[PDB]
């Protein structure tokens, strides 16, 4: 599920809420 954050050039600030970079945007479990 996309979280609402791009990660093309920086990692996910939303890593704190569980979101990780895949396919240039931040996701939690799809």
Residue numbers in the entry: 1 to 30
Q: How is this structure described in the published paper?
A:
Surprisingly, the four [I11L] mutants exhibited yields from 13%–44%, which is lower than that of the [I11G] mutants but still substantially higher than that obtained from the native parent peptides. When the Ile was mutated to Leu instead, bioactivity was retained. Using this I11L mutation, we synthesized all d-enantiomers of I11L mutants of bracelet cyO2 from Viola odorata and bracelet hyen D from Hybanthus enneaspermus. Having determined the crystal structures of wild-type cyO2 and hyen D, we were interested in definitively showing their Ile-11 to Gly and Leu mutants have native-like structures to support our earlier NMR chemical shift analysis. Their structures were solved using racemic or quasi-racemic crystallography.
This combination of structural features forms a cyclic cystine knot (CCK) motif and confers cyclotides exceptional stability. Cyclotides are divided into three subfamilies: bracelet, Möbius, and trypsin inhibitor subfamilies. Since cyclotides were first reported two decades ago, studies on bracelet cyclotides have been hampered by their low synthetic yields because of poor oxidative folding efficiency.
